[PDB]
Design a binder for this molecule. Structure first.
Ligand SMILES: [Mg+2]
Ligand SMILES: [Mg+2]
Ligand SMILES: [Mg+2]
Ligand SMILES: [Mg+2]
Ligand SMILES: [Mg+2]
Ligand SMILES: [Mg+2]
Ligand SMILES: [Mg+2]
Ligand SMILES: [Mg+2]
Ligand SMILES: [Mg+2]
Ligand SMILES: [Mg+2]
Ligand SMILES: [Mg+2]
Ligand SMILES: [Mg+2]
Ligand SMILES: [Zn+2]
Lengths: 217, 308, 115, 108, 59, 153
RNA sequence: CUCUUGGAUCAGGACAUCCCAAUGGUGUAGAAGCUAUUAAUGGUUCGUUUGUUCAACGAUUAAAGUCCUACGUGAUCUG
């Protein structure tokens, strides 16, 4: 059972009614266009109509590196390198000028954000434009690709080694001395994981949404 | 002691009566709300036709939140949601009493509890036979557009395509400094500055030997009435009484706002097309669609937009 | 977001940009009411002890949804008359350039890839 | 910056006798039915609460003697008995605390 | 009939009344005719105010 | 501006706040009735409730055991939580603690005080406030009104 | 024969107007310009010293105005 991220409400003081109203419109678009299941790390091809030109479409293939947004404003960003020039485009799922979304390769990665690929070697971001879809098996669990990438020289876009990011998909041993690793651990904040008032349990909310979505079907 | 003591409704209520009184009050609200559902069959005041220069009453709504929206050209617009909730007409002043050239009508909304209110307000509402409302405001209405007190109002009073005006109290930020409050530049961080980073410079010239009234200084910011002009209406939901308005509205979520049609010069006499006195569903000449849209709006469940 | 003294990359086949030099080019002026330069903006460039006009075609700062964000700040050299200095471009160029107010047809002709 | 003039007793009387600076009177004082001592409506009675805490100390003092050391918390429920009382069947296998005095009237 | 007072000479166009709000730029000067248009009683009232003794009993 | 901040600032910092609350929670489990200052007890009340939820999960749950180990400094009390307190509150869905304000401390700082406890303990009962009986004059009139409305439809 | 000013911050005001606005004359064909009348509305940029006795240079702008307010302003800061 895969419940898409946007359906889960964020916590706050907003009324539940505003969420019910938004959900109705989201479901209606899904009947017209089907939104496939995917996770950060999977490769996608998205087709959209080009506004500047007249009745001419566009296609972009890349790996999904982030999923954000709630409700009708949900987004996802996918990355690729063309002629040795890196490009990223941020897409909204419910934008009406998206013709089709195709999951070329469905897979999961160790982390739920891959923004550190900007600092990794170019090979880990390049994907063949014309690669054909790979088979999928219904009676299975989604695969977890456990690749650990290699990084370029130390000056980076962010300090990925620091404990807040919680990166588990970088080969730090190759790039950093053990002395530097202890230097980073001075920012740990160990107590955060053990305080019970910072945790948001959404199991019941997830369950209730499931039947209503299925019931509407 | 032969002296004053203070009380509250729950002080003397026993265990059984505590729940009973809660239930009794809730039923009283429902009976009084249903009775007012039929204005047209309750001796309505005469309904005059529209004439140039006419002004119409407005509503009180609650701010739900925001969401995106798209037009048939693919342009994306952020929109805010306003819900009408138990809006009634309360009191009428004739032109001479109000002291304005025009007459006035008072509107209330958002039913509230009766327990922690002054007696004066409760007596006022008992006369009108309605449960109390959180907020009252005043609207300037012409004689032809006057409406009898006690008549419910609904979101369908507005229709898509018309511009509107909204006013509400802004978010309160407390006592604030000159940099945040008035956007003052401040001073450099380094090069020898001594304990002067975010402070104002000179108040004024030395010659006057005083400070001009109205000088900009630190003080409490926010929590003031502000108005936004010329916001289009994109869509209306008849079932839940929801209005969608272009752009931003002042205040936090769950805050009451005042809605009235635009007073800008361009939209001077657009009221003729809209229901002139108000919208009455009691008439039941036709049942409205659940959702009302504007032509440029791209509705969901329509086919994907192709920029042919 | 290109500004005065920003270092930029010349994505062009012109000899002036192609030839390696000990200093990378730097922006000297932005032809805008604001100082910030975005895609479709001309700037004044300092190259090899010389000044030349140039046009921004990409940058690393986020924009609105559904538009491409590049990994480097890319520029094209433009002659005083407005004719491109170079004869070819290989890196992908955004399609937003077509409709933005300005003269972009000449550069679009020389560019093969549009993203 | 230093004062340029002495402030007079008349001006000073107006600053410190302003109604803003005076002690406000309280309207939430009531009498306790059980003991007859005073209390605030939203607060527990001090005299009545004082009784309970004294008994609580006695019980805990006895609990300390039985255990005999730290880190001896039982894994079974506890119960208190007074002279003249014997464990019931439901009391089987539960720590029993013994008090010399008779059961207090208020304690149930 | 304070609206029907009369001025000798060209006083309607030459007599100026001045006021200040108290804020920078709050100085306003208006002629007699303009003030008479806005308020039909101001001219007569201002004349009487000036001729009374300048003390608290004036008000 | 502090809109939407659900935590108090206590101690010497964020980590110090957790440690102070942990010490109070450990004392509550052992003794089952505690006195602290009103603000501190109110902040710790939330954690006390959530601890009884992990206890319900059971001894064999790996996550529950890890959480209990961190929040109880004295280790003779982990058996107590999983085998005494958790069984006691099986029926209820919440409201495991009772908290009341106590007269101000008489120690020259005059702090606002409170008493917090777990329901169902063996200690002498607290002197709680009782609502008025139904035999009083006002209650009877309301009772009369209820009977008429119930009987007459 | 000799011997207080800059900058930052925030600006109050005058009109002897630099730009924006309404007009007259022309050795005003159009487009550019030169001159005069009326008006204080808001605005009036960013960097740099090899030579220059209170100067100059680069890139721009619709314009980069002239002045008064104990250097307007050091119990707000600084060379
Ligand atoms: Mg955010
Ligand atoms: Mg950076
Ligand atoms: Mg917009
Ligand atoms: Mg606030
Ligand atoms: Mg600064
Ligand atoms: Mg400092
Ligand atoms: Mg003076
Ligand atoms: Mg006095
Ligand atoms: Mg708060
Ligand atoms: Mg000024
Ligand atoms: Mg002049
Ligand atoms: Mg001074
Ligand atoms: Zn008592």
């Amino acid at each position: 059972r895969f419940l898409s991220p946007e359906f889960i409400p964020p916590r706050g003081r907003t009324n539940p009614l505003k969420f019910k109203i938004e959900r109705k419109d989201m479901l209606d678009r899904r009947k017209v266009l089907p939104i496939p299941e995917f996770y950060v790390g999977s490769i996608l091809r998205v087709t959209t109509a080009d506004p500047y030109a007249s009745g001419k479409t566009s296609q972009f293939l890349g790996i999904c590196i982030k999923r954000s947004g709630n409700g009708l404003g949900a987004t996802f960003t996918l990355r690729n390198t063309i002629e040795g020039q890196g490009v990223e485009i941020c897409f909204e799922l419910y934008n009406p000028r998206i013709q089709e979304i195709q999951v070329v390769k469905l897979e999961k990665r160790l982390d739920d954000n891959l923004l550190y690929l900007r600092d990794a070697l170019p090979e880990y971001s390049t994907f063949d434009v014309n690669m054909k879809p790979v088979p999928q098996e219904a009676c299975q669990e989604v695969p977890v690709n456990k690749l650990k990438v290699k990084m370029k020289p130390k000056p980076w876009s962010k300090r990925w080694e620091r404990p807040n990011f919680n990166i588990k998909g970088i080969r730090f041993d190759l790039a950093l001395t053990e002395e530097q690793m202890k230097e980073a651990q001075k920012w740990n904040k160990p107590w955060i994981e053990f305080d019970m008032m910072r945790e948001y349990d959404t199991s019941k909310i997830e369950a209730a949404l499931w039947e209503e979505i299925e019931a509407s079907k | 002691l032969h002296s004053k003591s203070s009380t509250w409704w729950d002080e003397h209520l026993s265990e059984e009566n505590l729940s009973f009184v809660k239930q009794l009050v809730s039923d009283e609200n429902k009976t009084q709300l249903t009775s007012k559902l039929n204005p047209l069959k309750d001796e309505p005041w005469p309904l005059h036709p529209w004439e140039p220069g006419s002004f119409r009453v407005g509503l009180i709504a609650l701010k739900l939140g925001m969401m995106p929206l798209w037009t048939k050209d693919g342009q994306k617009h952020a929109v805010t949601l306003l819900q009408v909730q138990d809006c009634h007409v309360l009191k009428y002043t004739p032109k001479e009493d109000h002291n304005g050239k025009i007459a006035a009508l008072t509107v209330g909304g958002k039913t509230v509890s009766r327990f922690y209110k002054p007696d004066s307000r409760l007596e006022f509402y008992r006369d009108l036979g309605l449960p109390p409302k959180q907020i009252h405001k005043i609207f300037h209405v012409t004689d032809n557009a006057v409406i009898k007190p006690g008549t419910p109002l609904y979101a369908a009073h507005f229709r898509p395509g018309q511009y509107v005006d909204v006013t509400a109290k802004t978010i309160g930020k407390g006592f604030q400094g000159v940099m945040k409050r008035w956007g003052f530049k401040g001073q450099p961080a380094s090069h020898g500055q001594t304990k002067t980073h975010r402070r104002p410079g000179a108040i004024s010239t030395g010659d006057i030997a005083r400070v001009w009234p109205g000088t900009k200084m630190p003080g409490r910011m926010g929590n003031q009435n502000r108005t936004v002009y010329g916001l289009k209406v994109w869509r209306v939901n008849t079932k839940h009484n929801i209005i969608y308005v272009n752009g931003s509205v002042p205040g936090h979520k769950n805050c009451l706002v005042k809605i009235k049609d635009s007073t800008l010069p361009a939209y001077k006499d657009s009221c003729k097309n809209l229901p002139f006195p108000t919208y009455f569903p009691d008439g039941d000449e036709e049942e409205l669609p659940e959702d009302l849209f504007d032509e440029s709006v791209w509705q969901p469940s329509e086919p994907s937009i192709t920029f042919a | 977001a290109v500004q005065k003294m920003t270092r930029v990359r010349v994505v062009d086949n012109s000899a002036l940009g192609s030839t390696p030099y000990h200093r990378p080019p730097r922006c000297i002026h932005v032809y805008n009411k604001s100082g910030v330069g975005k895609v479709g903006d001309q700037i004044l460039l300092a190259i090899r002890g010389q000044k030349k006009k140039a046009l921004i075609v990409g940058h690393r700062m986020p924009g609105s949804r559904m538009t491409p964000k590049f990994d480097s700040n890319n520029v094209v050299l433009i002659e005083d008359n407005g004719n491109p200095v170079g004869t070819r471009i290989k890196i992908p160029i955004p399609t937003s350039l077509r409709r933005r107010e300005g003269e972009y047809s000449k550069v679009l002709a020389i560019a093969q890839n549009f993203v | 910056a230093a004062p340029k003039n002495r402030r007079t007793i008349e001006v000073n009387r107006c600053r410190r006798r302003n109604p803003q600076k005076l002690i406000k009177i309280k309207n939430n004082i009531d009498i306790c039915p059980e003991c007859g001592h005073l209390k605030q409506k939203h607060v527990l009675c001090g005299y009545c609460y004082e009784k309970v805490r004294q008994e609580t100390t006695k019980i805990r003092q006895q609990i300390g003697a039985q255990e005999g050391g730290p880190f001896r918390a039982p894994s079974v429920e506890t119960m208190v008995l007074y002279t003249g009382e014997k464990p019931s069947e439901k009391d089987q296998g539960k720590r029993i605390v013994e008090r010399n005095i008779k059961r207090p009237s208020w304690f149930t | 009939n304070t609206r029907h007072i009369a001025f000798s000479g060209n006083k309607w166009e030459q007599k100026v009344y001045s006021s200040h709000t108290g804020y920078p730029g709050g100085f306003r000067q208006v002629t007699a005719a303009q003030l008479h248009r806005k308020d039909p009683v101001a001219i007569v009232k201002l004349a009487i105010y000036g001729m009374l003794p300048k003390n608290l009993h004036r008000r | 501006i502090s809109h939407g901040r659900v935590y108090r600032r206590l101690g010497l910092g964020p980590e110090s706040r957790i440690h102070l609350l942990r010490n109070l929670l450990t004392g509550l489990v052992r003794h089952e009735r505690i006195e602290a200052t009103w603000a501190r007890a109110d902040e710790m009340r939330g954690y006390a409730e959530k601890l009884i939820d992990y206890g319900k999960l059971g001894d064999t749950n790996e996550r529950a055991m890890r959480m209990a180990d961190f929040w109880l400094t004295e280790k003779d009390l982990i058996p107590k939580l999983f085998k005494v307190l958790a069984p006691r509150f099986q029926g209820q869905n919440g409201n495991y603690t009772r908290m009341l304000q106590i007269p101000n401390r008489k120690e020259q700082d005059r702090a606002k005080m409170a008493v917090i406890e777990y329901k169902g303990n063996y200690l002498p009962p607290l002197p709680l406030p009782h609502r008025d009986s139904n035999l009083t004059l006002l209650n009877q009139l309301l009772l009369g009104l209820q009977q008429d409305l119930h009987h007459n439809q």
